[PDB]
Amino acid sequence: ALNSAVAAE
Amino acid sequence: SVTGRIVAMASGAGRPVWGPRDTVSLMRTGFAGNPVGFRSVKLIAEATAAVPLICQDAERRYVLDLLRRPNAGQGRAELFEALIGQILLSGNGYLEAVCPEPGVPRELHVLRSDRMAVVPGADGWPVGYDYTVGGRKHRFDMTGHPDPICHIKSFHPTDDHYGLSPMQAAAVALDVHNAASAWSKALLDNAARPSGAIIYKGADGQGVLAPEQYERLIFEMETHHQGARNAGRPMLLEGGLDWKPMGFSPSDMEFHETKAAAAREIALAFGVPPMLIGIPGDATYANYAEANRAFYRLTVLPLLTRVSAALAWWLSGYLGAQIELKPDLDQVPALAVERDQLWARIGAAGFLSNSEKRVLLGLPPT
Amino acid sequence: SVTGRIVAMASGAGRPVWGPRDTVSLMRTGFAGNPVGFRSVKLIAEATAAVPLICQDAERRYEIHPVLDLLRRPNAGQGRAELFEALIGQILLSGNGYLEAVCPEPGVPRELHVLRSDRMAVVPGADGWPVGYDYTVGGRKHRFDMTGHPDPICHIKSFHPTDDHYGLSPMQAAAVALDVHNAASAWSKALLDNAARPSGAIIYKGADGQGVLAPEQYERLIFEMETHHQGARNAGRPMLLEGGLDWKPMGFSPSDMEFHETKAAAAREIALAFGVPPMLIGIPGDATYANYAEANRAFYRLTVLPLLTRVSAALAWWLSGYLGAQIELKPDLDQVPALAVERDQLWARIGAAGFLSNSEKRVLLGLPPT
Amino acid sequence: GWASETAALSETATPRITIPLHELAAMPKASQRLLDDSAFDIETWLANRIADKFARAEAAAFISGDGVDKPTGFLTKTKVANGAWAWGSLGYVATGAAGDFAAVNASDAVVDLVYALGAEYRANASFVMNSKTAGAVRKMKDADGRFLWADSLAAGEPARLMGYPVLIAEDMPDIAANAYAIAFGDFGNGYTIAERPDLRVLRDPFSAKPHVLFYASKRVGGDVSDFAAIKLLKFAA
Amino acid sequence: LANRIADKFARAEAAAFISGDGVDKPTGFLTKTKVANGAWAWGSLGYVATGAAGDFAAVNASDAVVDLVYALGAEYRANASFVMNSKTAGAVRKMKDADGRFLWADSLAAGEPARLMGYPVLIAEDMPDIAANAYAIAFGDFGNGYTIAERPDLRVLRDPFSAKPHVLFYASKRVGGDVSDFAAIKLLKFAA
């Protein structure tokens, strides 16, 4: 859980 | 008043006179910067908030519900600790009152003075006050009777609109006390004393020692010659080596008596005696019962009788009857050495009758 | 008055005499400059405002008197305590005290304004009496006129043996001692702010007589000095000094006491001019007085009650010109709290002297007889 | 800057004018014999005419004074056409015709002069003109012959132009070839005056013995503090 | 510094609310594929034309404003307001009838009468100037037309590390928004 909406991860 | 038309047009009609530029650079360096300027204000502001008040001019000592509960936030004592904390810091105490009711206003707010400036106007007394925070003004009005701001001034001999604030008078001794405590703070943090030096001149006039020799020299210096467990190892110095022990000749007392004299000329300006806050020095007062009595007579009761007299006039513009409001100078615990020798003086004066000595002490005769 | 014509024409009749040339500068550097000159005035100005007054005309019954109604609140926004501390705060500062009076009704004027003595100047007039006072703010005159009976300004003077029109103001007498105390405090403020003591010096001569060290050597020298040899946590590292290097430890040979005994002696001469005892304001030194029952009794008898009895004596004569009957205002010398040890030995002498009767010792102590 | 999600945004741009406080001196000479026989207070009438001259000599330096040893007024501040306004200069708007207001439609060079300041400096701004310019503004008439300002021929000087005060400072240039005869801006922030708060006058019979030689001086200074808060009105293009 | 940050944020998001793109910034109402009114669809903002190609109509100005008003519908005109920059309200105030008397703000001494055609006026200095095809005046009910989604918190961070010679203040408000009701914002193209 490093990124917000941009990853989808 | 007749001279009002001549001092206001020279000072500038209808404009805000700002006054002191360093009214806030002395607060953060003389109240949050050193403990003597911190304690001396907090000693007085907590003391003038502790003396009770009585309502005279009513023909019998009874707005006392207003002062004991001004607003939702600060309490009675919290109000005066903030009010006197502005007069001792900037020489100017301000008091906003909101009055939805026509008389006896609901809340009292201590408007802080460093964001507050006067405007003189055409004549006499100031026409308005500007509470300028950020870039935004407020422009209160004094062109009426109730006058929503009481402006308590200390004595200022050259200015016509502000106070002098004893922190401004002791502004050098605050800087001597801040820097001399910053002298010793810095000197403990950037100063190299060595316990000695091992000098390796060599066969030449100069010579470094090889890293096989330097790791050997650290190991016999670390293991055998340093610490509390190694005080006195007789240190065989070979050919060429030498141990020159260094000293540290000024060790104690770097600006020690100039700081203590600066710490007392801060206490000299605010009016506290040096026994109360804890300044070391000579014994001027003896046994604290005369040092506390000198405090509540030279710099507390003269200060609170000028604030309570300005509360007495400004609040009496809201209710019709003029009110007097002065400190009680009785049931205060510091004037008990003043009080018991009064009760011993006329108490042993057995010539005058019993109804004649109750009136001397402030007792209702029966 | 017969000598008035030759003393008035000497300085120049009808033109203002400006007085002292530096009383407007001694307020900035002798009252807002040092704490001792600040406190010595505020101790006296807030003590003379504390003492009550007695209004007497042959029966002393006037506790409801209009003058005592006037002085209780002089003008809007300046009480009785704020009036006299501003009035005595002009007498001790420039030797001159002034009071404007505005009067719509021709008796007992409504307001008293302490006109400041920086911007006031006299007009010596015809018969040795000052005809006018000029209140000069900016470049604008006012010229009050005293060629009448009420004479709208009382002019409280201290004693001045040379000048005919002003006073001496004890700040002006200690102006050399204010300049020693202002400068010896700025000596220490400067010395803490621009002075260089090093804790040592690391001499690098080199193979020559003179040699700087390389920039790879200079970062190495700082890093073993910053990390291993400075701070409180590194007090005593044995500091291997190889060839060329040397650590010469510096000192700071006057550490304490830069003009310390000439500042406290200059602080006391400030307290000597205004007249406070040094135990009252808090100057360290020898205990001349003993135990604050003496020094506070010596304070209200040598420099407060002699000052207040002549300010109220000018108020007794200037106000009485507004109301027919003459008025006498003088301090109380009763229920002033520092004269209690004076009042004890008065009541203990006459209380124990039981040879005379009770109605004869009430009048010695000042009591209503029964 | 509009921080992206995964940009690792870098550091952005972090954001002194001196007022030399010059000196204004008056030293009027007066014979000592005169100061004794005249019935008028020549001591005071000289102190009245200096304070009048001082409030009027520094009033002119506040507008068209150069920097040298006197306060530099705002009219000497390298004026640049608006729209090309930089920080070191005061922005002006042009009237059209080369001598006076636009011949075809005047009173329009004023409404865009107003709207050339910004709604923050217009909170408290005021026009500054000399006497004979407010007259040329009042002489402005529409096609019918009525006055745009102070409509009726009675009741002149409405004390407001476009909703803002008007200061008739008679020390500004008049309407001329390229004069900035009308200045509009917020001077409470735009022009800072630094001054000493006293008018010192001191006599001395000592300098010239048969005379008195009153000496009178004050220290005043000031230049612009906010170039964005003062707009001018050039009468050229 | 907390004052000049809060000022720049209130002034940097003010421009995105009008002429911002969608990329990492709020999409202002001006970037919304304008289509001529009367042919107004849901995905676009309707505009009315002024006549002349540069500025207001030469023959009769002040009519491109009154028909801009009557292009909303009596429900969005309940509370609507014009949005212009400074030098446009000046060009609206420079509007004079045939005699020379300024239809808006009657006397010279008038000022901003604060109610063009009976509706408030917002002098937003981020709208375009009067130009070839600029929509320099927008009129509509933004209470329904433009939705701002934000968090009440500036969330400034004070950073004493990683820049030890400095202090490196950091501050990041979260805000966003585009049009929510295309029928409640009408524009004014200065084209023919």
Residue numbers in the entry:
A (entry chain C5): 89 to 97
B (entry chain B): 24 to 85, 90 to 393
C (entry chain A): 24 to 393
D (entry chain A5): 146 to 160, 164 to 385
E (entry chain B5): 194 to 385
Report text from the authors:
Gene transfer agents (GTAs) are DNA-containing phage-like particles produced by some species of bacteria and archaea. The genes encoding proteins that form Rhodobacter capsulatus GTA particles (RcGTA) are derived from phage DNA, which has been integrated into the bacterial genome. Here, we use cryo-electron microscopy (cryo-EM) to determine the structures of RcGTA before and after DNA ejection, and to visualize the interactions of RcGTA with R. capsulatus cells. Particles of RcGTA have heads with a diameter of 38-nm and 49-nm long tails.
The iris has to open to enable genome ejection. Therefore, the release of DNA from the RcGTA particle requires re-arrangement of the baseplate, which is consistent with the observation that one third of empty RcGTA particles lacked baseplates. The central channel of the RcGTA tail above the iris contains a trimer of tape measure proteins and perhaps also one molecule of peptidoglycan peptidase. These proteins have to be released from the virion before the DNA can exit. Some of the empty particles with the baseplate still present contained density corresponding to the inner tail proteins, which would not allow the DNA ejection through the tail. We speculate that the empty particles with attached baseplate are defective and never contained a full complement of DNA. The structure of tail tube did not reveal any changes after DNA ejection, suggesting that the tail is not involved in signaling to trigger DNA ejection after attachment to a cell.
